[PDB]
Amino acid sequence: DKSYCGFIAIVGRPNVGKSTLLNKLLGQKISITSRKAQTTRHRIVGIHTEGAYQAIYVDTPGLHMEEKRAINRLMNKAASSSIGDVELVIFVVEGTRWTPDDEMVLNKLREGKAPVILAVNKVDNVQEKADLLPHLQFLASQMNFLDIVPISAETGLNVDTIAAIVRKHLPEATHHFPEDYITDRSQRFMASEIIREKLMRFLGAELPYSVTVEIERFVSNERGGYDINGLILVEREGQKKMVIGNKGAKIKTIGIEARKDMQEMFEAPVHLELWVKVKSGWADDERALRSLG
Ligand SMILES: Nc1nc2c(ncn2[C@@H]2O[C@H](COP(=O)(O)OP(=O)(O)O)[C@@H](O)[C@H]2O)c(=O)[nH]1
Missing domain, CATH: 3.40.50.300 (P-loop containing nucleotide triphosphate hydrolases)
Known part of the structure; x- marks a missing residue:
């Protein structure tokens, strides 16, 4: 007992x-x-x-x-x-x-x-x-x-x-x-945690199993601010579209909220980019999209 x-x-x-x-x-x-x-x-x-x-x-x-x-x-x-x-x-x-x-x-x-x-x-x-x-x-x-x-x-x-x-x-x-x-106190980890939390907030009933978050890039700019690249990974294609959501508003909001909670916790500027990728490979439109501005 x-x-x-x-x-x-x-x-x-x-x-x-x-x-x-x-x-x-x-x-x-x-x-x-x-x-x-x-x-x-x-x-x-x-x-x-x-x-x-x-x-x-x-x-x-x-x-x-x-x-x-x-x-x-x-x-x-x-x-x-x-x-x-x-x-x-x-x-x-x-x-x-x-x-x-x-x-x-x-x-x-x-x-x-x-x-x-x-x-x-x-x-x-x-x-x-x-x-x-x-x-x-x-x-x-x-x-x-x-x-x-x-x-x-x-x-x-x-x-x-x-x-x-x-x-x-x-x-x-x-x-x-x-x-x-929390066994990982690094800011890099804290960014993940915020994204994971915003995913759980906004996906609700539709959120699938086996989603993973990963921070591909964490840097400080000249302006004493931050530049973060977030990568959200899902098992299958159909899921990738729930995340992006109708008219791209779902992934738009998730990004906005996360970049917000991030600036507040890091007390500094934050430029946040978020990508949704299907584990088994990018795609033709996506790969060509990756290398851009
Ligand atoms: N096909 C397949 N790939 C796997 C499996 N487990 C892990 N991987 C892949 O192996 C790569 C590295 O796994 P990871 O746990 O990060 O490696 P480690 O922590 O350094 O031991 C990742 O791309 C995983 O997706 C599996 O059971 N099957």
Whole structure:
């Protein structure tokens, strides 16, 4: 009748789909990505809190004192307040690709005490579904995995399977964090949050699943103001038009409101541009439209 809270690492070389899977695990209808991907002192990438379960996702396999201290700062807690250890490692790879980078990551998991799960991502993207079996057996001989589960972070295929395992490894404990805590204080992130919020405000009942927001460009001008490029991404074409809305008024208003809330929070000028793109490729009219004024 009490609670569970713990640290779950998500690891794997760049591009295997770590952030994509993280987002499917957080389960927000609108998600945020960042093609900049930078390293923080506390290594928290996201927090999933549902009922009595709080999963704290990090991007290092093990937490070292410097980092527990950074995590305590983030929460504004006395630096000697206790912090547990990574309880489960999600090792992520893509389809049947296997490189020395993949191995460098593996090397640091045996170095640890925590059980490792092997999430074979981009499974949807495998050419000959045959190649899989032999590869998986080769993968399995690399170390004792608690489990091996092929997934598509994009589709959601098997991600619930990862979730359920994660829940199982949360030690009994009080939650560290408040339910909706901001772990990324960067202005760049704050811009995303505002767009996501305006999307949720104005789309209402029509707003689909799997929308993601992303800030392609964040700069300060000479005028001590700001220039921001926002990119809103949707699964299918029909959705792209609900976002733009009848006569382009929907995306027009969203932009106006977001640029407003943005100027207020940044106490500075803001020029905001917003693009709606369908994940699977731009388009002919759109690409040619992109490179303009
Ligand atoms: N086809 C396919 N692409 C994926 C899948 N998961 C992620 N991707 C793509 O992989 C690219 C990078 O994923 P990302 O999470 O940002 O990489 P990472 O955080 O550096 O590991 C993105 O364009 C994703 O859309 C998947 O399950 N299938």
